[PDB]
Amino acid sequence: ASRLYTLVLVLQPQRVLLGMKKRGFGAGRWNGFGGKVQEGETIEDGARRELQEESGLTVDALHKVGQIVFEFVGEPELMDVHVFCTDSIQGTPVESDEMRPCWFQLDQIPFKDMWPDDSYWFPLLLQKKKFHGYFKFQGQDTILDYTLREVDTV
């Protein structure tokens, strides 16, 4: 059994939009925008909601780019993250209670201050290849196992 999560990456030709998480799960790490999927909304609905809540931004189209399943040692529920990207956004990203947004050149992505799995799967995101990932964490910082694959359908 897994819990659904969203992750939205605004990936333009020369830069990626990330947010510094100010509170809650993942505070202190840069990441794309997302969170738990609620009862009563589609996964993509929840993705749009978390983008708007955390950055003020809305988008015309979201594209499925990946799925990553996480196991945490001693935690019974797996976490199922659905990753989306978009290239065009509506509005200017602005700070919220959860996230401080900044653009990053693609050669200056802050991997040391991101989730450790990002350094593994971000290359596939940037080559615009669809992927399935699996990571076993011990705590929040230690990857014990992982698998990573490109897929034809996310």
Ligand X SMILES: Nc1nc(NC2CC2)cc(N2CCCCC2)n1
Binding residues for Mg(2+): 34, 50, 53-54, 98
In angstroms, rounded to a whole number, what is the distance separating the alpha carbons of residues 125 and 74? 30
Cβ–Cβ < 8 Å for 62, 84: yes
> Left, alpha or beta for 39 (phi > 0: left; psi -120 to 50: alpha)?
beta
Residue from 17, 18, 34, 62 touching ligand X (CB under 6 A): that is: 34
Residue from 30, 84, 131, 137 touching ligand X (CB under 6 A): that is: 137
Longest pairwise C-alpha distance within the chain:
42
What minimum distance in Å lies between the beta carbon of 122 and ligand X?
9
Residue from 35, 46, 66, 101 touching ligand X (CB under 6 A): that is: 35
Residues lying near ligand X in the complex (CB under 6 A): 5, 7, 25, 31, 34-35, 70, 81, 115, 117-118, 137
